[PDB]
Amino acid sequence: MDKLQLKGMSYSMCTGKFKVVKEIAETQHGTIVIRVQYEGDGSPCKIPFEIMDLEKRHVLGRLITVNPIVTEKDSPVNIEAEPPFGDSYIIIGVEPGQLKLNWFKKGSSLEHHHHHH
Numbered sequence: 001m002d003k004l005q006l007k008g009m010s011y012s013m014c015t016g017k018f019k020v021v022k023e024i025a026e027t028q029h030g031t032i033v034i035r036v037q038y039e040g041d042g043s044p045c046k047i048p049f050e051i052m053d054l055e056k057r058h059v060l061g062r063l064i065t066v067n068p069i070v071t072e073k074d075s076p077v078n079i080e081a082e083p084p085f086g087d088s089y090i091i092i093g094v095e096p097g098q099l100k101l102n103w104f105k106k107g108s109s110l111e112h113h114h115h116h117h
Contacts, residue, residue: 006066006067009066010046010067011044011045011046011069012042012043012044012045012046012069013042013045013046013048013067014038014040014042014045014046014047014048014069014070014073014093015040015042015045015048015093015094015096016038016039016040016041016042016073016093016097017039017040017093017094017096017097017098017099018036018037018038018039018047018048018092018093018097018098018099019036019037019039019099020034020035020036020092020099020101021035021036021037021076022034022035022036022076022078023101024090024101024103025078027064027080030082030083031062031064031080031081031082031083032080032081032082032083032090032103032104033065033078033079033080034078034079034081034090034092034099034101035076035077035078036076036077036078036079036092036099037070037074037075037076037077038070038073038074038075038077039093039097040073040093040097041073042070042073043070043071043072043073044069044070044071044072045069045070045073046067046068046069047067047068047069047070047077047079047092047093048067048091048092048093048094048098049063049066049067049068049079049081049090049091049092050090050091050098051063051081051083051084051088051089051090051091056089056091057087057089058083058084058086058087058088058089059084059085059086060084061081061082061083061084061088061090062081062082063079063080063081063082064080064081064082065078065079065080065081079092083103083104084104085104086104086105086106087102087104087105087106088102088103088104088105089101089102090102090103
């Protein structure tokens with residue numbers, strides 16, 4: 001009704017918030033998958049995402065599952081996106097409670113290190 005830019009595979013726009021259901025996964029093809037449950041109110045709507053540059057804190061990421069969609073406002077939706085390189089914080093949802101996940105990074109993965117005794 002008031003939209004005119006994403007013609008194709010579109011529905012609405014889950015503007016509420018998002019709960020990560022699973023850490024970003026890798027599609028084994030350069031992309032990654034983020035499973036999260038749409039939080040807020042939206043029903044069959046699209047999922048907010050942000051990974052490009054400027055106010056993205058990144059350089060140039062892509063979305064293979066561009067603005068995915070939830071069907072019941074609680075269906076854990078996985079988002080396939082192509083991270084550029086270095087610290088890649090994928091953003092889901094909208095500022096107002098939107099989510100964030102760092103992936104790719106430089107070369108190391110999962111900084112598993114901690115002192116204790």
